[PDB]
Amino acid sequence: QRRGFLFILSSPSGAGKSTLSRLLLKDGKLELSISMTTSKKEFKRKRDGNEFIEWAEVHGNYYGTLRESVENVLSTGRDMLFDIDYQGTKQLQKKMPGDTVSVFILPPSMKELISRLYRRAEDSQDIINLRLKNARTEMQHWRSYDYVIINENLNQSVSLIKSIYLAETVKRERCFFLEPFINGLIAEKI
């Protein structure tokens, strides 16, 4: 009845990604994308063939989403969740116009962002300060997002994100069933 879209969530410091993602995947309406990771020669071949809708190098290995694998899902009306950074977001939005919905999630304050990082004991003060620097770089790209949420309350934020998702499932442009259905109401014999 409708085309699926790629649901793109980004956060400076990307903190609580596993939690917010898990909360949005629980009911099953969103599919997680299975990324190809590092043959190395197939990655370059698929990249040189424009097979990737998104690609990045993380910790010395390549990760990518294949255009074919995403296009299969969206044609069936199933939506896909992406917890990625600005670099991935810009690649998808350029490649999939009309099929992307991007949400940027901001901290209520840097003081609160620092507090959350200082509750991840596996992070030295240096790593904390490096995460703060990357957070400031990411926040500068906020204008590339359809929606921006200030995470003042995680429960409110989950509610808002779910509303964004629900709202986008009934956008006129992606509900291709509307034209024959509405013509059918207009022509129905009474």
Place this chain on the structure above:
Amino acid sequence: NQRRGFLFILSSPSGAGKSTLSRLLLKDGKLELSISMTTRQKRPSEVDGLHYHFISKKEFKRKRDGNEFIEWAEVHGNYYGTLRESVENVLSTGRDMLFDIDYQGTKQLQKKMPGDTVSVFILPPSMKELISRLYRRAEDSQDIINLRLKNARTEMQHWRSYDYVIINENLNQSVSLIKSIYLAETVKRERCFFLEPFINGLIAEKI
């Protein structure tokens, strides 16, 4: 006024449940209802100022020549219009307005205030369901019913003017959707002008 107010436009073929959905959407107070001026004669059960301001054809004409209407249309043989001053006043406070109008008013608002309107078209699941709701509603003479059907068809011809289309299959689900559309648009980036100084605040904050 941390973000731009917007005009939340609900349209439906008469008998698809727009009026009931509007009442439920007004309950939590975030939306203010737009009161249209009208040249329709006030019905015995109506009260001026609750849904319409009932004025004369000459007074409607004079308001139109004085540019007082941000939007006006002839709907079912009577004139209806929204005063620009009433919209300006609600939106200056950063507040959102609920609108109960047809496609003619919708198109004017979208052309004058691009980006500040959110339009939702509500459809029946069938015309049989539409007729079933029209009978259950009123004193239900066949003439009024046929004519409401004709109007319903003409309004549905203009569905491409609407940002969202909802098929009213379940009333609770329909309320959930429209409320979800409302909430999503309050956090739409292009109307949150507060963002830039707040994010510059986050980037320039001392750590």
